[PDB]
Amino acid sequence: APTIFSRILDKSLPADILYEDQQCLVFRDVAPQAPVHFLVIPKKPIPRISQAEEEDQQLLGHLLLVAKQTAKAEGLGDGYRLVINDGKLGAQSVYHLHIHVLGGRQLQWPPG
Amino acid sequence: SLPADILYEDQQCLVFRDVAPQAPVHFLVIPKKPIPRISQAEEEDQQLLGHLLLVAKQTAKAEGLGDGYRLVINDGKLGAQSVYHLHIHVLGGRQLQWPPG
Ligand SMILES: [Cl-]
């Protein structure tokens, strides 16, 4: 049942943590696709965005605000990209909701 | 473009097809409040931002994206942000690659 993010959350797998509160955790991606690449994850183990529900509204907004706050802290003033992958066609890696934040280089278009 | 290209509307947001699609399904979720960039959202926007994500995933289901899809928000020049109003892109109907641009 638990994904590897369970170890990130319980600190049994050391990670470069940029932000933490009782709702979420932000840590660097160890397979980075940009000079800055971090993940914002809820502590509630919502597996994918398609499985979020109305009761998650506050949490989801909080994740976006934390993403943009952390982007500022990481010096992404010239721009960045937020990405959420759902399921196989979305190339979702781990089945625990995560927002990717990529910056520090020019992002291309299309976005994959 | 036609009125039916607005896939969803409420007092908080509008959802409409992208006329320069990058996938067989490609639509855009925008707030009615004119937040220019995600980097300029503020704490007061918490509920609105969560609503936009829920609307994105609800509309993805309505558009038949049951095998996966991708949400993208671009900020500024390095993000390739193309209009200075907040847009959540939703892309589906094909395999999305990695990296995401
Ligand atoms: Cl954009």
Curated annotation (Swiss-Prot), chain B:
**What is an annotated GO biological process for this record, any one?**
lipid catabolic process
Keywords recorded for this protein, A-Z: Acetylation, Apoptosis, Hydrolase, Lipid biosynthesis, Lipid metabolism, Mitochondrion, Nucleotide-binding, Steroid biosynthesis, Transit peptide
- Has UniProt tagged this entry with the keyword Repeat? no
Sites of the modification N6-acetyllysine? K57, K77
The name this protein carries in UniProt is Adenosine 5'-monophosphoramidase HINT2
Single GO cellular component term: mitochondrion
Q: Which residues form the active site?
A: H87 (tele-amp-histidine intermediate)
Q: Which residues of the full protein are shown?
A: 63 to 163 of 163
Q: Which domain of life is it from?
A: Eukaryota
Q: What's this protein's family per the entry?
A: Belongs to the HINT family.
Q: Where in the cell is it found?
A: Mitochondrion
